Amino acid sequence: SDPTITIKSYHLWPSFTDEQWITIESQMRDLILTEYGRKYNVNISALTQTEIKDIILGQN
Amino acid sequence: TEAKNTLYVSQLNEKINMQRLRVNLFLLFATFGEVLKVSMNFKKQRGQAFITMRTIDQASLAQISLNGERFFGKPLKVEFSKSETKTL
Amino acid sequence: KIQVAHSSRLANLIDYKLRVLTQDGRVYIGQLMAFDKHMNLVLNECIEERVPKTQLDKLRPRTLNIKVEKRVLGLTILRGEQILSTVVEDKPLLSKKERLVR
Amino acid sequence: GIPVKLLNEAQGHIVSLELTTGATYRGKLVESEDSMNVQLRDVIATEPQGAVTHMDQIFVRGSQIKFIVVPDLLKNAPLFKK
Amino acid sequence: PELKKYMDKKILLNINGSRKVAGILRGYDIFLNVVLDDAMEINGEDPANNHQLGLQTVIRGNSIISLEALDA
Amino acid sequence: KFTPSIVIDAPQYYVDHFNGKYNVDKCVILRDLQLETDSESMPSSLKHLTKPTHILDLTNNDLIMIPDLSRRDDIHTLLLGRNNIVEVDGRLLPMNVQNLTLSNNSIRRFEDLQRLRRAPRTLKNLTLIGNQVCHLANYREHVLRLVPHLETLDFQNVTAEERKSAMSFPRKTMEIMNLVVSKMTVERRNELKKQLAEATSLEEIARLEKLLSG
Amino acid sequence: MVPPINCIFNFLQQQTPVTIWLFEQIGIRIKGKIVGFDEFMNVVIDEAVEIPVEDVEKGTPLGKILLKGDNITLITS
Amino acid sequence: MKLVNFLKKLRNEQVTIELKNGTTVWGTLQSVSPQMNAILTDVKLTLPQPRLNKLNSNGIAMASLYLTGGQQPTASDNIASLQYINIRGNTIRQIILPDSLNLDSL
Amino acid sequence: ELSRAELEELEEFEFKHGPMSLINDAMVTRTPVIISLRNNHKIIARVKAFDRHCNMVLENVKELWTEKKGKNVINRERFISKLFLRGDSVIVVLKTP
RNA sequence: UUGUUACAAUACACAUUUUUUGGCACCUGGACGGGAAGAGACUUUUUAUAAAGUGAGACGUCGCGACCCUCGCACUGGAGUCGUUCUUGACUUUUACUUUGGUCGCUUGAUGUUUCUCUUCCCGUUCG
């Protein structure tokens, strides 16, 4: 999403900083939980972090 | 002489600009019919116009109503044309 | 305001009245009679219109109306190279010669 | 196509040219080419500055011509028939 | 390119930029490249402001605006 | 009566009158149809009026007001003659109107025309022949006071001294039947009178009403 | 009748200096000798100088250049 | 050769076309010709206001935007709207494409 | 002149040996080019295709351009996801390190 | 209802001078319009104040008003190829032009283009 953040020849993922990683992981959480909320018909804004952890890892 | 679609207008003011004669001959005759054409060729036919209406029942009414009307300070004359307009 | 079929190209718009923009900020308005591979464009009963610089500034962002210059041209061929866009003004109306009732 | 077979039917009539530079040339069309080159005779000419002049003959390169005005009589020339 | 009618008869050519040159038309091709002889740059008032180009001059056709045969 | 359906089938064509040669001005014809002013229906009908429209021929109807066409800017000519108009509220004329006709309407006092103050400054031509304010005292010199920059009234060219003087002040269908009779040969009057005495059928009344109106 | 490309060739083989006038860029002209010519009127110029607009005193030397034909208006003696 | 026949597989998408005037055209892409003449419908033509401010560069763009016959009641930032525009292909600078499109299928 | 199949293979040869092979290396390596456009805008993007005319489908676009406000001059910084680019508007393409 | 022949489609191709693979970019109060007024500035007579006019110089186009041509059935009109009938529809080809025009007044009725460097009174349309 930002070509100023290159992928090194010997790496697989772009060269984010820690702050950029926090931003990226938050956006990824929003994406996954948006699809989950549509599929299962649940209010994402009410979920606990432990429920979110189970959803991310794919428990059951 | 036979009543037909086309009026002959025959005593128009000379000193008035032709362009606004054509505009105002549209406006005058409009309230007595749907005016299709207002032909004016002053080199070939000075101080005259030919006007063609959608229906005979508008040509006759305008021929009656406007003959002798004062139009740019001169009393107009209006009669039936001996023809109908080709170019239209 | 006019609506034209979404499947319609410039070969169908014969006799429609087009308003044709050009690279210099002028617009030509006329009945499309014919056209070519190059987008060379023949317009009957044509009008050129332009926004003069005196009141172009009235389009700067702030009951909005603009007095265009207009100029009248007979049966123009526009060279396609100059054309910027084409817009449709209205459809092929009946001739007044059709309205005449015996 | 027709936007050039028209300009070939315009022969012997007065046509008015405008050019990309802003000049304008009105005169009798002597010869025209499929490239839109034209030759005008007895020509009334106008500068982009609005200054006006007259000149005996001119040839104009097609790539400069903005538009060509043609006599209104050609709308019923055989060219447009199906 | 119907320049055959002119031959060597003197031409003034309007050229890209404002520029003007005038000379004796020797030859031409399908692009309207023009080769012309005794060419003067028609820059302005002749006795000080014009310039005489050289014994052979050739103009690239995309730069010809228009050309007026001032000889007839 | 003023439906959204009759404005869309309204006959229309290009006309040369305003330019002489080239058919570059478009007329919409809503004449001879007896439309009338509804405060709800009409402004939801005239938003289906075709664009552009240059001449809008609303003549010989039963309108009681200028139909609100205020925000449109295409219309240059607006024919409203032979309508039951009371007052000319100028704010409801189109933005760029040029050329207005109000002949043979029902306007009778100077406070009817008083709202022409709000008409566009680019209005140049007006017509009020056959009204009854037409006959009131020094009416021309009054209506020039309302719209000084105008160019014509009742097909009289507004001359220089008239508009110069304008700045001094701060310092029912049987109309046509009578109109024909007013303008008729006395012997033909004494022939159609006899024909009306001779009349013998309802269709012959219809024929006689053709003669009595042209 | 002298075709124009043949006149370009008659500048080339005779190794005469030339002045070349550019297309939209009126403020400098190119002077030098035509070494190479082309189907598309590209040219190669040796001992090239670009002279502002008026004379040789103010010019600056380029070396050997290829000047792309899309930028040529006149070639002159 | 290739990439105009890629645009031809975008029929009925919501493109944004940016012309070389800097004028931006949002639109339902009805067609693209082999010369790249785009037809758009339900169209919305915009000069961006940071650009529009300088008249000397943008007067050609504003004058041609207004003269389409579709400039709105100046609600903001010189929009127009047209049912149909036919664009001559050489005028197009960029085409910003729908965000969800799977380009690799085309 | 040449046959259609020969022209096809010639286009492949030109894309690999010619100047265009800078763009091709970036398209195959999936690394971002920089593209100075004719209107002084610089695109930064990953190439997904190109053709003879230097048209190119781009993805992952960032687009830098500069704006002035009298004495001040300032940077804009639009992001775009998927963009066709008409070739003629291209001044010079880089490949970043 | 169907088939054969003649001419235009289209897909295809289409970056190096005449079109579509770029010489282009850079550069209470505020607002709007009409008519009276004033300071300041500019032109001219004249000198180390006295008097008459209007941010300055320049070029086109509609339009307005006044004076000379003007007495009325026109727009394609002739000639030829044919249906139908006391000359009305379709087609081919000569002829020179199809716009009334010449002059003056605009101390400007408006309008479009080039060169150089401020307030008061009312009136009308909006804002809160």
Side-chain angles (χ1 to χ4, degrees):
Chain A
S1 61
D2 194 321
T4 68
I5 310 167
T6 54
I7 305 175
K8 301 292 184 179
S9 58
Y10 42 82
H11 284 175
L12 297 184
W13 308 108
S15 309
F16 293 128
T17 64
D18 299 20
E19 310 97 48
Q20 295 177 317
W21 268 132
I22 290 163
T23 309
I24 287 279
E25 289 178 24
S26 184
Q27 286 174 108
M28 289 296 187
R29 193 175 301 107
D30 281 319
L31 195 165
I32 292 160
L33 295 179
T34 301
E35 177 50 36
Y36 189 91
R38 289 170 178 174
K39 177 170 172 183
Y40 292 75
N41 190 271
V42 293
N43 184 7
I44 301 307
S45 294
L47 298 182
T48 63
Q49 297 297 320
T50 306
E51 287 168 292
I52 289 160
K53 198 71 169 178
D54 288 2
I55 289 164
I56 290 165
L57 296 172
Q59 178 68 44
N60 291 88
Chain B
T1 315
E2 296 185 340
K4 297 191 176 168
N5 280 270
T6 301
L7 306 181
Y8 164 41
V9 182
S10 70
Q11 285 293 273
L12 292 157
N13 181 305
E14 288 287 85
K15 291 170 61 169
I16 183 73
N17 191 343
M18 161 176 278
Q19 163 60 359
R20 75 196 283 216
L21 266 189
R22 181 180 269 118
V23 172
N24 286 284
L25 282 174
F26 168 67
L27 304 182
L28 180 78
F29 282 84
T31 56
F32 303 100
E34 200 185 316
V35 173
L36 302 183
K37 185 66 165 229
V38 182
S39 304
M40 305 185 76
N41 323 286
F42 269 19
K43 190 176 285 191
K44 286 171 161 286
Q45 293 292 318
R46 185 88 75 78
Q48 299 158 94
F50 287 72
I51 304 191
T52 299
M53 298 258 184
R54 183 177 155 199
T55 68
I56 309 161
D57 297 1
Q58 287 159 338
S60 181
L61 171 55
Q63 189 284 330
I64 292 165
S65 182
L66 288 174
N67 180 300
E69 179 58 292
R70 277 183 171 79
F71 181 56
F72 290 94
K74 188 176 177 170
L76 198 58
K77 285 191 185 183
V78 186
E79 297 192 25
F80 284 107
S81 175
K82 294 192 76 173
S83 73
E84 296 195 326
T85 305
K86 296 170 178 173
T87 183
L88 185 44
Chain C
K1 209 164 190 182
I2 184 63
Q3 310 283 274
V4 192
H6 287 259
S7 306
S8 189
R9 287 180 177 157
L10 187 65
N12 315 127
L13 306 187
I14 292 294
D15 315 318
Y16 287 58
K17 184 151 297 191
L18 294 180
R19 57 197 295 150
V20 178
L21 287 56
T22 53
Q23 281 286 3
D24 53 354
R26 285 132 181 274
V27 160
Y28 302 75
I29 314 186
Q31 285 195 38
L32 185 73
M33 284 192 78
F35 80 122
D36 218 326
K37 177 186 72 176
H38 286 288
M39 210 184 185
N40 287 347
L41 219 73
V42 176
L43 304 174
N44 195 7
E45 58 170 50
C46 176
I47 306 290
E48 183 173 25
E49 308 208 321
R50 57 177 289 266
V51 174
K53 303 189 292 182
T54 60
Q55 59 189 262
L56 178 79
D57 56 4
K58 300 213 301 182
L59 304 172
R60 190 171 74 180
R62 295 182 181 172
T63 56
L64 175 60
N65 67 329
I66 294 282
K67 299 177 183 175
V68 301
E69 190 200 305
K70 82 189 294 193
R71 171 182 172 207
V72 184
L73 310 170
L75 197 64
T76 45
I77 302 148
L78 280 74
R79 186 183 172 85
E81 174 170 10
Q82 305 299 342
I83 297 181
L84 195 82
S85 286
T86 285
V87 175
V88 68
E89 176 96 319
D90 58 23
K91 66 180 182 182
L93 271 52
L94 278 61
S95 66
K96 71 193 191 274
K97 183 176 171 63
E98 182 63 26
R99 295 224 78 197
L100 185 147
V101 190
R102 184 174 67 104
Chain D
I2 286 179
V4 171
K5 290 182 176 182
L6 179 64
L7 185 61
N8 280 262
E9 174 50 18
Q11 282 181 99
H13 302 156
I14 286 62
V15 305
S16 186
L17 255 64
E18 185 168 306
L19 275 68
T20 304
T21 186
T24 300
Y25 299 90
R26 181 183 171 76
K28 186 174 181 178
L29 186 73
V30 182
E31 184 146 33
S32 60
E33 303 177 22
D34 300 357
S35 193
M36 302 178 73
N37 302 313
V38 297
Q39 305 215 94
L40 300 181
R41 172 166 290 162
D42 299 330
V43 193
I44 302 92
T46 307
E47 300 300 326
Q49 296 182 355
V52 175
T53 186
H54 186 284
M55 57 184 66
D56 307 55
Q57 189 156 315
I58 196 163
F59 176 108
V60 180
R61 187 196 166 77
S63 182
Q64 298 296 337
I65 295 179
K66 192 191 294 184
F67 61 73
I68 300 172
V69 176
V70 173
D72 193 82
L73 305 170
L74 271 51
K75 69 195 177 193
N76 294 110
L79 178 64
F80 295 107
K81 288 179 176 290
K82 301 291 184 294
Chain E
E2 310 321 299
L3 286 299
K4 189 175 178 181
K5 204 176 187 73
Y6 301 127
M7 305 184 71
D8 315 83
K9 282 47 178 178
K10 188 171 176 181
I11 303 303
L12 187 150
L13 295 103
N14 290 96
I15 280 178
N16 199 70
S18 56
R19 299 178 294 189
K20 287 181 291 185
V21 308
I24 295 176
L25 172 66
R26 298 304 190 187
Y28 62 93
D29 62 18
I30 297 304
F31 305 111
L32 305 184
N33 304 314
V34 149
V35 64
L36 88 177
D37 191 6
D38 295 325
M40 194 91 76
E41 176 182 354
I42 305 301
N43 179 33
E45 178 150 42
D46 186 23
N49 301 275
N50 289 351
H51 287 85
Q52 179 66 228
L53 297 188
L55 300 182
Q56 284 284 30
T57 286
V58 64
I59 296 154
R60 195 168 199 251
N62 82 337
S63 297
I64 285 174
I65 303 301
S66 53
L67 65 102
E68 39 160 320
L70 60 77
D71 283 346
Chain F
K1 189 161 173 65
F2 217 130
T3 72
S5 61
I6 195 157
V7 71
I8 295 176
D9 288 346
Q12 70 201 245
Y13 52 107
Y14 284 109
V15 291
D16 16 6
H17 311 142
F18 291 80
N19 282 291
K21 294 174 182 178
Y22 305 114
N23 302 297
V24 301
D25 301 88
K26 179 175 153 198
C27 66
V28 171
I29 301 303
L30 290 177
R31 71 189 295 139
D32 301 314
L33 287 172
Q34 322 302 352
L35 285 53
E36 67 181 309
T37 303
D38 286 333
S39 301
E40 286 187 31
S41 190
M42 184 171 72
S44 191
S45 174
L46 293 171
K47 289 181 182 299
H48 294 75
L49 175 67
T50 180
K51 293 192 74 157
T53 291
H54 299 103
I55 303 151
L56 182 56
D57 190 352
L58 281 162
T59 59
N60 197 30
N61 294 327
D62 286 310
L63 284 86
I64 213 171
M65 193 181 74
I66 304 297
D68 185 9
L69 295 160
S70 181
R71 290 184 187 185
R72 286 183 62 137
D73 53 355
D74 52 333
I75 302 147
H76 64 64
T77 298
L78 184 49
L79 312 171
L80 293 165
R82 287 163 69 182
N83 278 281
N84 315 333
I85 313 298
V86 168
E87 52 162 304
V88 187
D89 196 347
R91 75 203 162 93
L92 310 175
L93 291 169
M95 287 196 75
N96 305 327
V97 75
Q98 196 182 22
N99 185 316
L100 176 58
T101 292
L102 297 165
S103 173
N104 292 40
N105 295 355
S106 301
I107 310 200
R108 270 182 252 87
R109 58 168 54 251
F110 296 96
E111 293 79 24
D112 304 333
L113 302 167
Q114 174 265 0
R115 284 196 184 175
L116 267 168
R117 187 186 294 278
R118 278 205 169 205
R121 189 166 67 261
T122 189
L123 172 64
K124 283 185 74 167
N125 189 321
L126 186 55
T127 296
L128 296 153
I129 199 69
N131 289 273
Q132 273 189 249
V133 61
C134 177
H135 269 124
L136 281 178
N138 60 250
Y139 116 87
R140 285 192 75 265
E141 171 158 20
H142 194 100
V143 59
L144 269 85
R145 197 259 173 276
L146 277 42
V147 56
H149 51 262
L150 201 87
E151 207 71 77
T152 294
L153 298 102
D154 294 349
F155 317 108
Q156 303 296 306
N157 177 82
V158 175
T159 62
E161 297 200 46
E162 299 176 55
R163 55 169 64 106
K164 183 174 180 289
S165 70
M167 311 304 163
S168 63
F169 292 84
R171 299 174 285 160
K172 186 238 69 176
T173 180
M174 302 298 285
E175 170 172 285
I176 305 300
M177 184 257 207
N178 285 277
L179 185 56
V180 171
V181 165
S182 179
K183 298 181 184 294
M184 175 148 51
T185 302
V186 171
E187 314 307 331
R188 190 178 189 268
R189 174 58 164 165
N190 282 269
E191 180 71 356
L192 292 192
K193 277 173 70 180
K194 200 177 187 184
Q195 173 61 95
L196 183 54
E198 293 160 87
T200 188
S201 166
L202 186 61
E203 303 298 339
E204 293 294 320
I205 289 290
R207 182 181 62 81
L208 184 55
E209 277 203 283
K210 295 195 80 67
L211 290 167
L212 256 49
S213 193
Chain G
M1 180 60 74
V2 180
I5 70 176
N6 294 14
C7 186
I8 303 170
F9 186 66
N10 285 14
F11 291 104
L12 186 150
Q13 68 171 22
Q14 302 190 102
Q15 206 171 7
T16 175
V18 295
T19 305
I20 286 191
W21 293 32
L22 303 186
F23 187 79
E24 200 70 18
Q25 188 161 341
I26 291 152
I28 68 179
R29 282 193 179 95
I30 282 178
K31 199 178 70 170
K33 289 174 290 183
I34 293 175
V35 177
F37 109 120
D38 196 54
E39 307 302 332
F40 318 117
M41 198 166 175
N42 297 290
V43 296
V44 193
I45 305 297
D46 198 355
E47 302 188 68
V49 62
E50 67 188 14
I51 33 167
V53 182
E54 189 68 39
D55 48 5
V56 64
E57 288 291 342
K58 199 61 57 169
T60 181
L62 301 179
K64 203 191 304 268
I65 76 169
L66 192 153
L67 179 62
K68 203 176 180 286
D70 188 50
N71 306 303
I72 303 295
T73 282
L74 290 125
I75 309 186
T76 66
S77 320
Chain H
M1 177 163 75
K2 202 180 191 302
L3 292 188
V4 170
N5 294 282
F6 153 80
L7 298 179
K8 292 188 73 188
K9 303 184 185 186
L10 301 171
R11 299 187 76 177
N12 319 318
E13 296 302 332
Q14 295 296 114
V15 301
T16 296
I17 282 191
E18 293 212 36
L19 305 189
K20 285 166 178 164
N21 319 83
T23 178
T24 294
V25 186
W26 178 281
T28 311
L29 182 60
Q30 299 310 319
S31 181
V32 180
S33 93
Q35 306 301 342
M36 204 179 158
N37 299 333
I39 310 293
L40 306 178
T41 60
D42 192 11
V43 195
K44 189 177 185 181
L45 289 99
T46 304
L47 272 165
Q49 66 92 22
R51 166 162 187 74
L52 189 175
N53 291 341
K54 189 164 190 67
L55 275 282
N56 306 72
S57 312
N58 296 276
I60 300 293
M62 279 186 256
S64 55
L65 202 174
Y66 173 79
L67 288 169
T68 55
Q71 183 160 349
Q72 296 296 283
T74 185
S76 272
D77 308 333
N78 291 19
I79 289 155
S81 302
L82 305 177
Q83 186 256 341
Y84 178 100
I85 196 171
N86 177 2
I87 285 157
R88 187 190 160 87
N90 76 279
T91 323
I92 296 164
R93 192 188 301 287
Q94 299 165 359
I95 306 191
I96 298 172
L97 294 176
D99 194 45
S100 62
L101 193 72
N102 57 332
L103 291 169
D104 297 298
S105 63
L106 311 174
Chain I
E1 185 73 299
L2 266 298
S3 173
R4 174 170 175 72
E6 302 297 344
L7 293 165
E8 176 197 305
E9 288 284 12
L10 178 62
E11 291 292 352
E12 295 288 296
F13 188 94
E14 289 275 47
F15 292 143
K16 287 177 69 60
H17 296 273
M20 293 277 188
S21 197
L22 179 57
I23 308 167
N24 207 332
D25 181 51
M27 171 177 163
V28 174
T29 308
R30 295 182 167 75
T31 190
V33 296
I34 294 182
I35 306 184
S36 294
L37 296 188
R38 196 77 168 248
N39 58 317
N40 299 316
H41 288 48
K42 297 199 308 182
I43 292 176
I44 312 189
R46 297 179 204 261
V47 192
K48 293 290 178 134
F50 52 81
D51 69 9
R52 174 168 55 229
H53 305 117
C54 203
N55 306 321
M56 53 183 82
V57 179
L58 303 179
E59 276 215 56
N60 196 178
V61 172
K62 178 180 183 173
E63 184 178 7
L64 291 80
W65 57 288
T66 186
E67 171 193 355
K68 62 171 62 182
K69 292 287 169 65
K71 191 59 54 70
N72 297 304
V73 63
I74 193 162
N75 308 93
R76 299 193 87 87
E77 203 164 33
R78 187 167 66 165
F79 284 85
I80 303 163
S81 303
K82 301 181 195 287
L83 179 154
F84 173 101
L85 178 65
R86 205 185 195 248
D88 55 40
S89 297
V90 177
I91 300 176
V92 56
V93 180
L94 286 70
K95 196 188 89 198
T96 193

